[PDB]
Design a protein around this ligand. Structure first.
Ligand SMILES: COC(=O)Cn1ccc2ccc(OC[C@H]3CNCC(=O)N3c3ccc(OCCCOCc4ccccc4OC)cc3)cc21
Length: 328
């Protein structure tokens, strides 16, 4: 089964799901870096800006809704956000499942209030599900209709916007052969990166740092120290919320590579700077940024949309691995 995705300025890739009877539709991101299903609830007080311009879920218009109401909580660097657990039929790419999701009653506004999509679908493992709730993909496996205990991602360059494939891969969007990397500590789609490189000066992640293959992440992230180092060491200036470089001097910034289980994944200037134009006047942003991630998971890096745009990604639960292939 394939889920068509939409790309909002190469920074947000979402899809559509259906909750309830009749199907209440939600625009959502499929995040391999989280494990629950979250949708803005209708019972979400309007006092939260995140609950004013996004589809809300009304249990009141669903014949299939089942009440549980367990309070869920998750603090996210601007943390807070909470709600309760509800059950109901969700539909993804044709498939139907009786899933447990959270209805957001409280939300820290940002970043959400800027989301062109409404909710998030956790593609992560059951080991990290709030309330220890069975993840959606897990439930889909239970039905035994798929072909492979796997699912692949494809983020496009923007302006088809993207595509997720449940239970398989799609050859139309990648070339070459998948080179796999085993998961460090299964329970997380995290792999053992072996050094980041800025081309000549392979100074970074020397030894053995970690890396998250986060589809729900738009940029590539690393500790604040790491990013600072990598940043200026590119001619990249630091701003209020993202590094940049005069637009006209972007096309000649070094290449970035990630030594991942046997191969060198390289991103070029084109892959990491939004070349709004080539003016020698205006500034241009880099699809990279600080972001400090807390343990036990981190501080690991985060290979998000920037990476995925270039390398088609497959997550294979069957063998706790992850493949990468030149995206086409
Ligand atoms: C290419 O990716 C993008 O463009 C992603 N992107 C853009 C804006 C943005 C915001 C949150 C995010 O989420 C990113 C994930 C990232 N991976 C780890 C993780 O833990 N995440 C995460 C964060 C926050 C969550 O909040 C759930 C509250 C329910 O409510 C969530 C909610 C309610 C109302 C409106 C939107 C909304 O967000 C889906 C759930 C999952 C990714 C985002």
């Amino acid at each position: 089964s394939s889920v068509i995705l939409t790309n909002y300025m190469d920074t947000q890739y979402y899809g559509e799901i259906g909750i309830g009877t009749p199907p209440q539709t939600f625009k959502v991101v499929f995040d391999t870096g989280s494990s629950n299903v979250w949708v803005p609830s209708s019972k979400c007080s309007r006092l939260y800006t995140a609950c004013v311009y996004h589809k809300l879920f009304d249990a009141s218009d669903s014949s299939s809704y089942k009440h549980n109401g367990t309070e869920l909580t998750l603090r996210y660097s601007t943390g807070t956000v909470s709600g309760f657990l509800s059950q109901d039929i969700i539909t993804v790419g044709g498939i139907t499942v009786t899933q447990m999701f959270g209805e957001v009653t409280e939300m820290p506004a940002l970043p959400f209030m800027l989301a062109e999509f409404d909710g998030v679908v956790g593609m992560g493992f059951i080991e990290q599900a709030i309330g220890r709730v069975t993840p959606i993909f897990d439930n889909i496996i239970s039905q035994g209709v798929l072909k492979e205990d796997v699912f692949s991602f494809y983020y496009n360059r923007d302006s088809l916007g993207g595509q997720i494939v449940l239970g398989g891969s799609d050859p139309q969007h990648y070339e070459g052969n998948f080179h796999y990397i085993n998961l460090i500590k299964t329970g997380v789609w995290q792999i053992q990166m072996k050094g980041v490189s800025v081309g000549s000066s392979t100074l970074l992640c020397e030894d053995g740092c970690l890396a998250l293959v986060d589809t729900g992440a738009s940029y590539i992230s690393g500790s604040t120290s790491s990013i600072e180092k990598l940043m200026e060491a590119l001619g990249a200036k630091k701003r209020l919320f993202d590094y940049v470089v005069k637009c006209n001097e972007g096309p000649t910034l070094p290449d970035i590579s990630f030594h991942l289980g046997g191969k060198e994944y390289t991103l070029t200037s084109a892959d990491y700077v939004f070349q709004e134009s080539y003016s020698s006047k205006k500034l241009c942003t880099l699809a990279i940024h600080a972001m400090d991630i807390p343990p036990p998971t981190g501080p690991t890096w985060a290979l998000g949309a920037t990476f995925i745009r270039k390398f088609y990604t497959e997550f294979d639960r069957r063998n706790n691995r992850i493949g990468f292939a030149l995206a086409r």
